[PDB]
A paper describes a structure:
Five tubulin-binding cofactors (TBCs) are implicated in late-stage tubulin folding and heterodimer assembly 1,5–10. TBC-B and TBC-E are implicated in binding α-tubulin, whereas TBC-A and TBC-D interact with β-tubulin. TBC-B comprises an N-terminal ubiquitin-like (Ubl) domain and a C-terminal cytoskeleton-associated protein with glycine-rich segment ([name]-Gly) domain.
Crystals of the [name]-Gly domain of TbTBC-B were obtained from a construct producing the 81 C-terminal amino acids. The fold is dominated by five β-strands, β5–β9, forming a consecutive twisted antiparallel sheet with β9 returning to lie in an antiparallel fashion at the other side of β5. The side of strand β8 forms the floor of a solvent-exposed, primarily basic groove, which is flanked by the two extended loops, linking β6 and β7, and β7 and β8. The TbTBC-B [name]-Gly domain has a different sequence in this tubulin-binding motif at residues 195–199, GKGDG. Glycine rather than asparagine occupies the third position, and this nonconservative change precludes the formation of a side chain hydrogen bond with the terminal residue of an EE[Y/F] peptide. However, and fortuitously, in our structure the C-terminus of chain A forms intermolecular contacts with the basic groove of a symmetry-related chain B. The C-terminus of TbTBC-B has the sequence EVF, which is similar to the α-tubulin tail EE[Y/F] motif, and so these intermolecular interactions can be taken to mimic the association with a relevant binding partner. The peptide-binding groove on chain A is occupied by two formate molecules, derived from the crystallization mixture, which bind in similar fashion to the negatively charged moieties of the C-terminal peptide just discussed (data not shown).
Numbering used by the authors: 153 to 232
Write the structure that this text describes.
């Protein structure tokens, strides 16, 4: 299970980020979605869907992914 605040690596390409949203979003496709804020500007979006905000996020840092694309783990930003 995926919770808001979780750290993650996301497909494709092991994109590092934080889970900002988990839930259904009708204006996308049916089923559950995970809103991710990436550390780097590798997101397809900015946390909105056709303009409507779902989670706070800046342009190029936001993605909505299916849960199968999200690996929750201990992935803190590298600092040392």
């Amino acid at each position: 299970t995926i919770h808001v605040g979780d750290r993650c690596l996301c497909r494709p390409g092991d994109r590092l980020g934080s889970v900002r949203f988990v839930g259904r979003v009708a204006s996308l496709k049916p089923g559950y979605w995970v809103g991710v804020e990436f550390d780097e500007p590798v997101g397809k979006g900015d946390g909105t869907v056709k303009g409507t905000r779902v989670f706070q996020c800046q342009p190029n840092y936001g993605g909505f992914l299916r849960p199968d694309q999200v690996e929750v783990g201990d992935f803190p930003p590298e600092v040392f």
